[PDB]
Scaffold this active site. Sequence first.
Site, short mmCIF file in Angstrom:
data_model
loop_
_atom_site.label_atom_id
_atom_site.label_comp_id
_atom_site.label_asym_id
_atom_site.label_seq_id
_atom_site.Cartn_x
_atom_site.Cartn_y
_atom_site.Cartn_z
N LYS A 132 0.88 -1.18 0.00
CA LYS A 132 0.00 0.00 0.00
C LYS A 132 0.91 1.22 0.00
O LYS A 132 2.08 1.11 0.34
CB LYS A 132 -0.93 0.02 1.24
CG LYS A 132 -0.21 -0.05 2.52
CD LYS A 132 -1.19 -0.01 3.68
CE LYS A 132 -0.50 -0.17 5.02
NZ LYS A 132 -1.56 -0.11 6.08
N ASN A 135 3.30 2.00 2.87
CA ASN A 135 4.41 1.06 3.01
C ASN A 135 5.43 1.13 1.89
O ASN A 135 6.30 0.26 1.77
CB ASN A 135 3.86 -0.36 3.09
CG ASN A 135 3.34 -0.65 4.46
OD1 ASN A 135 3.66 0.09 5.37
ND2 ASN A 135 2.53 -1.69 4.62
N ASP A 148 7.89 -2.60 5.82
CA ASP A 148 6.83 -3.29 6.59
C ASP A 148 6.75 -4.78 6.22
O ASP A 148 5.83 -5.22 5.51
CB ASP A 148 5.46 -2.59 6.43
CG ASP A 148 4.48 -2.91 7.59
OD1 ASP A 148 4.92 -3.35 8.66
OD2 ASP A 148 3.25 -2.72 7.42
N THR A 166 -4.44 -4.82 4.93
CA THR A 166 -5.14 -3.57 5.17
C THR A 166 -6.39 -3.66 4.31
O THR A 166 -6.30 -3.98 3.11
CB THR A 166 -4.26 -2.37 4.75
OG1 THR A 166 -3.13 -2.29 5.63
CG2 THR A 166 -5.03 -1.04 4.83
N1 ATP Z 1 13.27 3.22 7.03
C1 ATP Z 1 12.51 4.31 7.25
N2 ATP Z 1 12.87 5.55 6.86
C2 ATP Z 1 12.10 6.64 7.08
N3 ATP Z 1 10.91 6.58 7.71
C3 ATP Z 1 10.44 5.40 8.18
C4 ATP Z 1 11.21 4.17 7.97
N4 ATP Z 1 10.52 3.15 8.51
C5 ATP Z 1 9.38 3.68 9.02
N5 ATP Z 1 9.34 5.02 8.82
C6 ATP Z 1 8.26 5.95 9.24
O1 ATP Z 1 7.98 5.65 10.62
C7 ATP Z 1 6.63 5.14 10.74
C8 ATP Z 1 6.56 4.01 11.76
O2 ATP Z 1 6.91 2.77 11.17
P1 ATP Z 1 6.78 1.39 11.95
O3 ATP Z 1 7.16 0.26 11.01
O4 ATP Z 1 7.52 1.47 13.27
O5 ATP Z 1 5.19 1.29 12.27
P2 ATP Z 1 3.96 1.44 11.21
O6 ATP Z 1 4.09 0.28 10.26
O7 ATP Z 1 3.79 2.87 10.73
O8 ATP Z 1 2.67 1.23 12.17
P3 ATP Z 1 2.08 -0.20 12.63
O9 ATP Z 1 3.27 -1.11 12.83
O10 ATP Z 1 1.36 0.17 13.91
O11 ATP Z 1 1.15 -0.59 11.51
C9 ATP Z 1 6.21 4.75 9.33
O12 ATP Z 1 4.79 4.85 9.16
C10 ATP Z 1 6.99 5.69 8.43
O13 ATP Z 1 6.30 6.94 8.21
#
Ligand code: ATP
Length: 280
Positions: A132, A135, A148, A166
Amino acid sequence: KKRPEDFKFGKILGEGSFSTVVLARELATSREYAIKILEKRHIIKENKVPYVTRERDVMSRLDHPFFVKLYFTFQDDEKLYFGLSYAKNGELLKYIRKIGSFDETCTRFYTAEIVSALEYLHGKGIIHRDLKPENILLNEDMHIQITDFGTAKVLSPARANSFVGTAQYVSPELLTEKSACKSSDLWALGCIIYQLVAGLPPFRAGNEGLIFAKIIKLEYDFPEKFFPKARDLVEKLLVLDATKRLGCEEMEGYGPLKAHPFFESVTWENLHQQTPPKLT
Ligand SMILES: Nc1ncnc2c1ncn2[C@@H]1O[C@H](COP(=O)(O)OP(=O)(O)OP(=O)(O)O)[C@@H](O)[C@H]1O
């Protein structure tokens, strides 16, 4: 081998339900990483360890320019840390929202990178299952960086049984047969292409159940102006029969998909080194 002391932590990049992503500078190299930090007591108590282990396992296998890279992991008494490549430009979703929809050149280019990414991923026998625009991150150069992997599945060298995803992007087979395959990602690709052009994904409602009912009926329409060759591609991906989607193994894979007329001007070879078209 790395430790928290090895980094200077900066701004929070984002937060998940059981994680925080923080921008960090490694002192010894001056390199920037996005560090994902999980609280050990919280993941144990909320039963998230399978997802954490899955994310580490899947990501360790990946080595392609269109995916966020897992560089290292460490832990202390309270926390696990995943050092990830920093995708400076954030989520693709932010850009769909801002500009409203992508022109044909941008749609073509970003769709091509996603198709390239999925060809790599399915070649390694891995299904994403939560593809999506949120991600799909974007690096400094505006190339995609898919992320993700906690709900990804390594298929053992066709079908996977966990219910994950999702609602807007979930495939009909996951709803009706309770399993997903590589073709489920191609369904999500169809939704994303449609979303790039139309501004919203094709199955929309303010609750999941209503979305599910539309998905199983293939109930959606194209907006009046929608690039005809893009529409034709979407119609070949948003197909109820998972064995009949362009790009699936029963349709003989990524060759015929990349050969779709929508991609005619695409040079597939070195996509990650081409200058992306400007969004706006
Ligand atoms: N490698 C990265 N570089 C830059 N930003 C990132 C990166 N990984 C994640 N993010 C940002 O941080 C946020 C948090 O990511 P995380 O994987 O911890 O949880 P999420 O997938 O957003 O939420 P959930 O796990 O609750 O569905 C993401 O939504 C994204 O906007």
